[PDB]
Amino acid sequence: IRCIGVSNRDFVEGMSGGTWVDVVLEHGGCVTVMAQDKPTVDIELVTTTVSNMAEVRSYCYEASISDMASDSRCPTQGEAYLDKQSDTQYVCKRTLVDRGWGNGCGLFGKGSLVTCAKFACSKKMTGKSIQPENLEYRIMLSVHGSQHSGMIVNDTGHETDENRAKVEITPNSPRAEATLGGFGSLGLDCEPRTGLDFSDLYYLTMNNKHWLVHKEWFHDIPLPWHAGADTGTPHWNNKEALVEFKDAHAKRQTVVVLGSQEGAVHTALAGALEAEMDGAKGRLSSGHLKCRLKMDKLRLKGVSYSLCTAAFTFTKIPAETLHGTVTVEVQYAGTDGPCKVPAQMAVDMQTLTPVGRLITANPVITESTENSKMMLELDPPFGDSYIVIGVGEKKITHHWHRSGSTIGKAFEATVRGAKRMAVLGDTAWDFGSVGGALNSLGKGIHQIFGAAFKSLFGGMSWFSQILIGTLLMWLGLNTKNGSISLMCLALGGVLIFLSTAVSA
């Protein structure tokens, strides 16, 4: 449920005894945890929301000029004053201009004048700030079993219902026991800080279009500043790059405005992530986090339930996911009550030889009603399959044949783990989460090493990191004393793998 056909999902287990399943919660995929007990659970990060943003310096990219002024002065009488310049609403620059005979100025030679004009502007760039507090995570999770066609479509009553739950997380209130009447308590405690490395992030809204920007880049943009300001005529700062002054070969200086650079800041925005409904409530797309998840109290609701002997029937052609598993929605009337129902698979029967991954443990049916649809899934082994459902003779079976080999499973798992290794960096650790020694060792070694990788190879671009990896390779063959040339090979391969990022 809720995590099928959402590829980039994962399945994580926990070696039973001391529920310690710290998942790397994803705002761009789902994660399903399983346990021999403790009905299998999913978690998917719906949205990310920020409550309060502060109004740091704004920017203007659309300006307008008027009431120009030159204020010529003789080659020797000082240089131009132009009382206009007195005001800051005007932008002015002072230029040495030629002044000859038949030009006034009984002398002649290089004189000077100060060309300038009013700086009126429009289309401000509200570059607000946000901080790791009064931001807000909002997730929804779903246990399997009941709830034919889970399917967020009618989520409203599903958080009121038992199979789905909606959770809000604050850096003030990190804990949340996702309580499911009859199912469990789903203990959760997360790190609402180290998700997106906030406090270096600004919420820019330009043309009612919002996004997040690494505040360093936002500080480095050379447009006019509102600079902190509030109401009152905006005294724009630096006021110069926008307008452009130009004299003739020697004389008569004028000014151009260079219009609006809206699309220019767009093409300069080539790394930000866009963001939506903003109100006093600013929502944004993906951003990960670390969530210690505990199976403290999850009762499976119907381990004692009988296996009512009605004949079961498929409805939809149980296609499989990229993760190899396969979901089926099986309907049946014929019996009543809160039923337990069998679901196994085999290679031969007259054995039924229950084999393979059972994901949707304790599949439960609610009521006496007609052919309830009983959505669930299982995962077959690498060969042909025989998924068996009903009970015995009036059961229903079906071929599968996963067609995914065991070494192939390791392939998909390791390339997935490697992509995690890349994008989550340190956080890719404790993903399969037991508090084992080598786990904290990996966390720490990546901590120091990748932090150095940041501070040394600061924000290496696509092309940059590409050629850096290439020349590191070329050098990894050249140098003697493999000890360091192997380190060249290592960093170069790290760089190239970083260039194998999601971009493909």
């Epitope: 309060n52 509030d230 009152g232 109100g279 006093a280 409530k281």
Partner: antibody, heavy 132, light 107 residues
Framework: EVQLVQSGPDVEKPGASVKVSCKAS????????IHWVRQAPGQGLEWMGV????????ASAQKFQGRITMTRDTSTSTVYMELSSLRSDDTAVYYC?????????????????????????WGQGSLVTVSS | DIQLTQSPSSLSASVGDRVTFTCQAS??????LNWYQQKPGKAPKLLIY???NLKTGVPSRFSGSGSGTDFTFTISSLQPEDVATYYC?????????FGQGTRLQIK
């Protein structure tokens, strides 16, 4: 006794500038954010802006950006409000009020408030009319 | 962004009645809400800070409550000095707005 006092009612030209004074009494003048709030005769109250008696810090709302100026006068413990480019809506009564933990120079509302948030010295109200 | 509706628009009641005013804002104003009552030609009357707190000197005839986005003020017993226009106003995010009003009348 903590108490604010405004200047007398005034009538101005459309497009002129009016300055209303607000003098404080009974407290250390540098410890209370002065809030200005407008009220049209039939309309409700709408907060105009805020100034800090210390350091002359200022802020307002966009309904007055470019016309409103707010200055301090530490000597007589006063704050002066100028509305510029007067307009037919300006005929109203304006109120000045002391507010909260005026520590440095700001509005500063993420921390606490109340305890006469800004309501002990609401003074008397400055009636202004804008016509010819 | 600070739109705050204050219901009803007006009311009129006899002496000794309870009356309640509601104000819901479009935003989250967790506890930064305040309440006044003002006569024409008056500085307003000490009613409520933080939407739940009685000020010193205020009669216990008044009370305020509400948590998330909508908040209720209440006069326990109506009295002749209760004729005024009542106002609720938020404190956060600083385009500070007030309600248009809730007006009273004795019968």
């Amino acid at each position: 006794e903590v108490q604010l006092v405004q200047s007398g009612p005034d009538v101005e030209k459309p497009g002129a500038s009016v300055k209303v004074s607000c003098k404080a009494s009974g407290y250390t003048f540098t410890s209370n954010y002065i809030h200005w709030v407008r009220q049209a005769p039939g309309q409700g109250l709408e907060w105009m802006g805020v100034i800090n008696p210390r350091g002359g810090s200022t802020a307002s709302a966009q309904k007055f950006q470019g016309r409103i100026t707010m200055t301090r006068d530490t000597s007589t413990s006063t704050v002066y409000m100028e509305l510029s480019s007067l307009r037919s809506d300006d005929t109203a009564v304006y109120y000045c009020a002391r507010g909260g933990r005026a520590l440095f120079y700001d509005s500063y509302t993420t921390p606490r408030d109340g305890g006469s948030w800004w309501f002990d010295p609401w003074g008397q109200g400055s009636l202004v009319t804008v016509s010819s | 962004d600070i739109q705050l509706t204050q219901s009803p628009s007006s009311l009129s009641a006899s002496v000794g009645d309870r009356v309640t005013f509601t104000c819901q804002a479009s935003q989250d104003i967790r506890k930064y809400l305040n309440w006044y009552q003002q006569k024409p030609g008056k500085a307003p009357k000490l009613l409520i800070y933080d939407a739940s707190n009685l000020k010193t000197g205020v009669p216990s005839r008044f009370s305020g409550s509400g948590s998330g986005t909508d908040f209720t003020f209440t006069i326990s017993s109506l009295q002749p000095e209760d004729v005024a226009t009542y106002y609720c106003q938020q404190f956060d995010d600083l385009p500070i707005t007030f309600g248009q009003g809730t007006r009273l009348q004795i019968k």
